[PDB]
Structure 1
Amino acid sequence: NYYDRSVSPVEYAYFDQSQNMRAINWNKIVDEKDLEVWNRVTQNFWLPENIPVSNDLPSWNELDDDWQQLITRTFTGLTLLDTVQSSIGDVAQIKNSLTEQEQVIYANFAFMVGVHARSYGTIFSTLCTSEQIEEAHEWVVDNEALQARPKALIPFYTADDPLKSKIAAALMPGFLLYGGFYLPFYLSARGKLPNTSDIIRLILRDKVIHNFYSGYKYQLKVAKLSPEKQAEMKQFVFDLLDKMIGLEKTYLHQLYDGFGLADEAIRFSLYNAGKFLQNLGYESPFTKEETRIAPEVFAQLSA
């Protein structure tokens, strides 16, 4: 068959030029799961302009300067993480794909995480002053605890280990932003910024698929490895997650300093750390007490 004696262009470009290139074949596909994911993420296309964030103005005006600062800072920090994933992380997955369709799906992911980053700008334009916006950018650049998180993960994207790169690509949508996502749901549970929470739910509708898919592809690759190499990768995952949780806790304590929200946000974050691990085929070590989310906040998350 033509497929078994040719390579996809990205394999030609970065791995092996010994055989000629094949065009993508969407009429005969290797993995049915790729078509399912492709259809879902493309049919879920959205842009921030179609949520009426202006209707949040009354409840925004109920919040003082400190709360408004917290929200702008929180969201600008999430914007940084999306900028990392759109511009580096998801595109780095393309060349390490198992299938042709997967290469196209990661292109979609990079674009949609771009749209996620863009959506915070829409919220800021609708609600924040230009000085609130600028202050939050200054704060993000100068917050070492914030910066430590992407600085720890970026090297996996730029190094030559596809499995470690894949783990980072799952960890970003699966875990790293949930500490910040706590804030809008905490607020909307109390009748504040309901339209902003609709944008957050559109973002999560994508991110849950991004985490699942990267975890799915990770599991396919690692299952081929020897038991010793499988154990080595598991050890790497739990060690990296442990480090990222340490960094996330430090950052969230700084972010929410004065508001009391950090310990709840950390539990919300750890619930998702467990989900991240589950999507890689591992068991969550975290207790029900460690991952406890208030019913009113969980209702916002799961709507």
Structure 2
Amino acid sequence: DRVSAINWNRLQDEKDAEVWDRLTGNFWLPEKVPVSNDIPSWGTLTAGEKQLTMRVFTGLTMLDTIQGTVGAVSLIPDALTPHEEAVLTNIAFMESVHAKSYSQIFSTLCSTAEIDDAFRWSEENRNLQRKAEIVLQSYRGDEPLKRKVASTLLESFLFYSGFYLPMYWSSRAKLTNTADMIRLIIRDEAVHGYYIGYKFQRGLALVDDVTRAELKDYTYELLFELYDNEVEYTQDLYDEVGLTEDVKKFLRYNANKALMNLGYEALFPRDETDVNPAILSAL
């Protein structure tokens, strides 16, 4: 059936206009960040440190490929307003921009062989493939609200967690221009998670008590299914440079943030999410 022409002179929810204006006013492309000034500092990393960074960036690239090309678009049919549909087309585009920014970093700093090996690792890593399957299954299913749970967990939990490393390097005066690129991605991702979680809460208010309890159950279930897999992914990547336990605190910190974006309470208390202060500055 019918599509109505959109009328931006009759807003149904002013939040849609505010998010449009913010997301569009923050438009950027990766070519405008001078990553080539990181070449000296990338030279000071060991082969193991460079491999870890490339692998983490390849995993993030996967999540943005999923969010732009499947995630954000699968939300469009469930919009409450026409203007939300428009915002979702911007979010899809910007996820593609985020995914391409990693290729711009690699193109400036790394060799073809190192890149090919990072992409091959991502195809074969069981934890990365499992995290993709879990969100893809929710996006392709037929329950709108559960899809926004998965999306917010992708934006505010899974994604945010791989940002640890560029911020760890930045805090040691390394790879500072790469860190600037990543802060452009975070500035988008904080809005996406906020907006999608907002629309989730508006959707929740229109269902009965039973459905609402079902969604809180599902949120916790998917959160801990993702969290379990994310810990295993985190261990295999970070164990050798010794950052695992601090990244796991960052994961707990971010899980709380995902829950709050959805309108639920923080689960982990403050003294168990106490990330190295330098990492928090760098965001």
TM-score > 0.5, shorter chain as reference: yes
Task: Give the secondary structure class of the aligned counterpart of 1:177.
Answer: helix
**What is the alpha-carbon distance in structure 1 between the residues aligned to residue 12 and residue 59 of structure 2?**
38
Amino acid corresponding to residue 94 of structure 1 in structure 2: I
* 1:82 alignment partner in structure 2: 64
The counterpart of 1:158, out of the listed 140, 149, 160, is 140
Q: Select the structure with the greater relative contact order (CA < 8 A; seq sep ≥ 6).
A: 2
Contact in 1 for aligned 2:150/2:222 (Cα 8 Å): no
Out of 176, 188, 210, which is 1:228 matched to? 210
Provide the secondary structure at the position in 2 that maps to 1:107. Answer: helix
Task: State the distance in 1 between where 2:3 and 2:53 align.
Answer: 49
Residue 36 of structure 1 corresponds to 18
The residue matched to 2:80 in structure 1 has which SS? coil
Which blocks of at least 5 consecutive residues in structure 2 are unaligned?
Answer: none
The percent of aligned pairs where both chains have the same amino acid is 47
**Is the CA contact (8 Å cut-off) linking 1:179 and 1:252 kept in structure 2?**
no
1:146 is matched with which residue?
Answer: 128
The AA in structure 1 aligned to 2:272 is: E
Q: CA deviation at 1:255?
A: 1.4
Q: Would you say 1:122 and 2:123 are equivalent positions?
A: no
2 CA distance for matches of 1:42 and 1:113?
Answer: 13
Secondary structure of the residue aligned to 1:135 is helix
Shift of 1:191: 0.5
Give the letter for the 1:112 counterpart: M
Alignment match, 1:91: 73
RMSD over aligned Cα atoms: 0.9
Which runs of 5 or more residues in structure 1 are unaligned? 1-16
When structure 1 is superposed on structure 2, of 121-130 and 250-259 the one drifting more is 250-259
| Cα distance per residue 1:153-199 (max 9 Å; x no partner) | 11111111111111111111111022311000011100110000101
Partner residue in 2 for 1:26: 8
Correspondence 1:37-76 to 2 at 5 A: 37-76=19-58
**Deviation for aligned residue 1:21:** 3.7
SS for the counterpart of 1:289 is helix
CA contact (8 A) 2:161 2:254 kept: no
Matches of 2:242 and 2:158 in 1, distance apart? 20
Deviations 1:26-83 (A, max 9, x none): 0111000000000000000000100110111111011111111111111011101111
- What is the 5 A alignment of 1:131-280? 131-280=113-262
Q: Which amino acid aligns with 1:295?
A: P
Residue-by-residue CA offset, 1:220-279 (whole Å, 9 max, x unaligned): 011111122111111110111011110100111011131111211121122111011111
Distance in 2 (CA, whole Å) between partners of 1:170 and 1:63 is: 34
What is the TM-score when the length of structure 1 is the normalising length?
0.92
Q: SS state of the match for residue 96, structure 2?
A: helix
Q: Give the number of aligned pairs.
A: 283
Measure the CA separation in 2 of the matches of 1:136 and 1:52. 22
The equivalent residue for 1:289 is 271
Partners of 1:240 and 1:173 in 2: CA distance: 14
